[PDB]
Ligand binder design. Structure first.
Ligand SMILES: NC(=O)C1=CN([C@@H]2O[C@H](COP(=O)(O)OP(=O)(O)OC[C@H]3O[C@@H](n4cnc5c(N)ncnc54)[C@H](O)[C@@H]3O)[C@@H](O)[C@H]2O)C=CC1
Ligand SMILES: NC(=O)C1=CN([C@@H]2O[C@H](COP(=O)(O)OP(=O)(O)OC[C@H]3O[C@@H](n4cnc5c(N)ncnc54)[C@H](O)[C@@H]3O)[C@@H](O)[C@H]2O)C=CC1
Ligand SMILES: NC(=O)C1=CN([C@@H]2O[C@H](COP(=O)(O)OP(=O)(O)OC[C@H]3O[C@@H](n4cnc5c(N)ncnc54)[C@H](O)[C@@H]3O)[C@@H](O)[C@H]2O)C=CC1
Ligand SMILES: O=C(O)C1(C(=O)O)CC1
Ligand SMILES: O=C(O)C1(C(=O)O)CC1
Ligand SMILES: O=C(O)C1(C(=O)O)CC1
Ligand SMILES: O=C(O)C1(C(=O)O)CC1
Ligand SMILES: [Mg+2]
Ligand SMILES: [Mg+2]
Ligand SMILES: [Mg+2]
Ligand SMILES: [Mg+2]
Ligand SMILES: [Mg+2]
Ligand SMILES: [Mg+2]
Ligand SMILES: [Mg+2]
Ligand SMILES: [Mg+2]
Lengths: 328, 328, 328, 328
């Protein structure tokens, strides 16, 4: 009832498009927009990404120059830095424009009140559900992916059509779909995913390895092969996406079904408590504070935790093994 | 140091192979063994799988007949029923043989002392790391998968070569590898996987859905798209298998990296406790008892939990959605 | 809205009826069905109940013979044994029939997946709300009782009429009523009753006796007379059924009303917790496992608990007293 | 095995040395380097320390000028501010140099990823084990002190010799020794000292004073004399450094030995727990965040805690007393 499976592309036509930030997402999205008959110019600071963009047949102007030239702008730089960059390079140029469309790939900065623009511009959002490195793949298979879109500020009365045209232009639909929502919901959901069932999974795997090796005298090779060094999880996830999370298990053994179901219904309350805590922590705005301050300090915790993860026993063993298998 | 990347196939040659149980694994393995120039006959009870095997150009004899004819037998029926079936249909025919090789796809029945054969036969094990429905795929891509192999009883002094020839014959190597271990370790690892980080993941996802819908007024469609209805997890898992569990995250956003790492190191002790409890429960032999009794009663808990899972709100919503997307 | 107060009886007419199990319920139901112009034959194993049935003018055939002869069958044997008896004596004869109606007095075996029949038969349920020894009584007063009915499998499109005709035939309606429901609900409710407020009541009575005697120097006779050896509870329960559980108390003293209400609202949370625990334990299917295994072991706990109950002080005292009063 | 007791000094010769920050450490180290035939110029902002350096026969250039002139630079300013100062005054001048040696007196900024230089420079560390005011003393006694040294980045293949020459040049060896380590270990150790057994000691002393005065009616003078106003602790610490922490106690009374040992082995677990917590807090990088943010806010907690410490009863009493004794 709140979905789209295809839409138009023409309101983009004639206009000029500016993709600020040629990284994980800017690279892919700009490439596809080019392939869809949309002349896109890139705006980036002077670094290696500048070299790259300039090297892939892109007119890499400076940010403000791009905004000047462009009627549509895509703010594809980290969720952590498009505030310093906003009022210092965009908001001024914005006081000059009157017809301008501004897009995000997330609701972080705006849902938490870090970027509040004026009544002159159209303020939208369109967010994929991939990592970018997994979008090149689907595009090379004539496929599409899902997205979420939402609008905060309707200056021209035409927001939704612009959003849907963008969706079609970057390669989401046709082939996938898109749903309408707020910014709050998008932010909440992305962060719940990033905070609840990803880290829990990783910690459980790590704990299984540690235990099996240090209390049951197992060989690292076998542990790694069983837990994640094999492509089992990938096939399971594909079957989940194709058939259903539960129906999928009809391809497992009954032993697996039974153990999984029992232990799932056995541990539900604990993870429920955890999810409650984290979703509350987010809904308030505490995490955004935590994170912006982590920047302003210089990313110390970031650094140390990367180090601790890559200097763990499991990671060294994985190094040796992946070496053995020729995997890079 | 404990690995193989290719081996021979000839000791299989001349002999006859019997695949008892033409299901998830028997189907695939028998098919591939056929394709590798190994004449395989199938042994199964009279049901739909009998129809299937007989229909795919297989000489579907009765079990005992297959054992008679066969010099090698593969016991690919559920981990729950190859005891009634063992002494009643195999052990007698076995008292007649003297040169016979017997294979398992797991160490459950033998590690826990439910099947102890006599000194006359070779008792091995060879176990994949896939669900079967995900092996047809890799075989249709000229690829291989990992396995684990181990031997309990060496009657002919030639166990390991037989095991490795089987590995090569069913399609594991070349393309993947195989490692040697006990039966205890294999069982422990498979069950730890099936009991710790799969059900935890599923329960966390379910809890996220429930919370987001019942305490923050979210639309089911968006929740499902974010959490699992999208193919994000599949791409993440592929990148994990390819590059590494941590290095993979270099393709994410820094926000995701930070939240994930923090919450991973924050909740490690809890999941560690859980894994300890479950691994202990297994190492003792309690779960095998639990499970065999669940059979002998008639699978009541099994039934009820399937019902509860498929009659939850999330599953109905997924039904509607997958319908909308054309997914079956 | 989901009720019936009378219905037809003719679809039963012409057909033959088989009552498998001539015990607490089979005796009574078969007797009444006879009295309602329904020729019923009995099917039972060779024991004292066989003698009884054969002695009360019943054609006591063997089970399979009864099923052959019969177009309708009633499975009135314990909830614990109609699985061994099902596939070994019924399911085979069933593969031969195509028009056959099968009835239960409970949803235990089918709700938990211990008996799943084929698409050929009509699978219903009709369950009273009495103990059998209390139905002879009401029938000897031209009265009726309540029941619950539900159907799992509609093979002929006529289930409900068959169920209602059976209800009318055994003596429920007219005089009482009947309601439609699932099997799950019936099972849940019967077991909640049998697990929550019956045993709690008995334990409270026993504790009152023990305390009054061992800490306040009371005579056993008086304790027994007050608590249950008197017919007070019977009259209270009759008034409850007639007027209402609360309105009834208008015939008590105000002292009783006050104490009862206060202590009821005072202890509600505790019993609520207990009921939650037990209903959960049931909804999962754990109790069915517990119980089937108790059989397969040989009913040890059953035996020991009967012994402990009949060898308690209260029971001996009740023996002496009931002897004094001439009560058997 | 990882120690040095003397080394060379010549690689310093010919080069020019720049000491950025003429404070607690820069003053002392620069003075000694002068005395060792090493021409050192000072780089500092315009304040009283500028006056001082310029007044002690130092060419006090501006920071960038010093870096230009200098082939070796010592970054002896607070651990809290050499980031603003780094990229704004050093990193630019650094892009011009190719042969440059850069030294720290600690591993804080670099171990936590607040300062990551380019592959062009040599990045070392050399850290004393004194407070500076206690180094002038030992140098005026022809003695030396210990240090720790470590290198993060070897651009010229000559790091260690440079580090050891610096050690010899500032007055550590000969007379003391030096050990090699990472940056992580140095940081961890310094901070563990500053967080565990210093503050615990001070709090215990304060508590003893408070208790003795407010619950046993003692005179402040006596409490202060016993606990710290006497030079007992100094002599104890000297004997510890000379003989050993335990052997030292052979000069105490047996009463003291007994009480000390008993209560030491009695309270070990508690302090162990505390040390665990704090070392973990550090290893993650949380404290560095805490501290950099304390700066960015304006040092409020710092200020308030100084006030609370100097406005406590004990401090006023110490004021009066030290006045009485002529101590300043
Ligand atoms: N795969 C992913 O990482 C996903 C990202 N998104 C969203 O899209 C946005 C892009 O995220 P990523 O590209 O992955 O992060 P990223 O780390 O790859 O960002 C790199 C880009 O940001 C630019 N940049 C970096 N620092 C800058 C600075 N101080 N000033 C100006 N420009 C700077 C650089 O030019 C570079 O091109 C995020 O905001 C996120 O909300 C949504 C879907 C998934
Ligand atoms: N994808 C999977 O399920 C995996 C299975 N394995 C191992 O391989 C074995 C096969 O597991 P699955 O094929 O998935 O289970 P399954 O449920 O698919 O087993 C079905 C097969 O078992 C036969 N069978 C069933 N009941 C029987 C009975 N009472 N008497 C005689 N035969 C009966 C049937 O002929 C049928 O062909 C398991 O023991 C497991 O340890 C190892 C890797 C993954
Ligand atoms: N540095 C210290 O130990 C301090 C000691 N005090 C007080 O002064 C007193 C002396 O303490 P310390 O000399 O350090 O102990 P200590 O262990 O050095 O005592 C040794 C002396 O005690 C004599 N002695 C030992 N056992 C004896 C015995 N059974 N019978 C007769 N004489 C015996 C010996 O002749 C020897 O000279 C203590 O009571 C203490 O309260 C006060 C300030 C500090
Ligand atoms: O490989 C495994 O872990 C599975 C099993 O049932 O043993 C398929 C799920
Ligand atoms: O950083 C994000 O937002 C990701 C998401 O889509 O959840 C890629 C990981
Ligand atoms: O006999 C009793 O227990 C009653 C009383 O009020 O005393 C009638 C209820
Ligand atoms: O002065 C004290 O505290 C000492 C004693 O034993 O009394 C020397 C240690
Ligand atoms: Mg995100
Ligand atoms: Mg996401
Ligand atoms: Mg398994
Ligand atoms: Mg497995
Ligand atoms: Mg009952
Ligand atoms: Mg009942
Ligand atoms: Mg120090
Ligand atoms: Mg003393």
């Amino acid at each position: 009832d709140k979905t789209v499976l295809d839409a138009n592309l023409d309101p983009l036509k004639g206009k000029t498009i500016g993709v600020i930030g040629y990284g994980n997402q800017g690279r892919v999205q700009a490439t596809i927009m080019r392939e869809n008959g949309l002349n896109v110019i890139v705006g980036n600071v002077k670094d290696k990404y500048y070299e790259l963009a300039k090297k892939e047949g892109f007119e890499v102007y400076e940010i403000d120059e791009a905004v000047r030239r462009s009627d549509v702008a895509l703010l594809l730089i980290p969720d952590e830095v498009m505030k310093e960059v906003y009022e210092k390079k965009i908001a001024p140029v914005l006081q000059g424009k009157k017809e301008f469309v501004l897009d995000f790939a997330s609701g972080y900065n705006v849902a938490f009140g870090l970027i509040r623009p004026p009544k002159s511009v159209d303020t939208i959002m369109v967010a994929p559900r991939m990592v970018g490195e997994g979008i090149m793949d689907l595009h090379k298979q004539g496929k599409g992916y899902p997205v979420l879109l939402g609008v905060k500020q309707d200056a021209s009365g035409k927001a939704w059509d612009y959003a849907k045209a963008i969706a079609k232009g970057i390669g989401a639909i046709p082939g996938g779909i898109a749903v309408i929502s707020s910014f709050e919901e998008e932010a909440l959901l992305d962060l719940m995913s990033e905070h609840t069932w990803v880290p829990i999974l990783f910690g459980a795997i790590k704990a299984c390895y540690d235990i099996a090796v240090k209390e049951y005298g197992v060989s690292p090779e076998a542990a790694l092969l069983e837990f994640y060094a094999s492509g089992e999880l990938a096939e399971i996830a594909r079957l989940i996406a194709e058939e259903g999370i539960f129906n999928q298990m009809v391809h497992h053994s009954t032993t697996s079904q039974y153990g999984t179901l029992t232990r799932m219904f056995k541990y539900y309350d604990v993870v429920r408590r955890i999810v409650e805590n984290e979703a509350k922590y987010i809904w308030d705005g505490s995490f955004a504070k935590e994170w912006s301050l982590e920047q302003q300090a210089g990313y110390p915790v970031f650094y140390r935790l990367w180090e601790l993860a890559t200097q763990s026993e499991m990671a060294k063993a994985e190094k040796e093994l992946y070496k053995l298998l020729g995997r890079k």
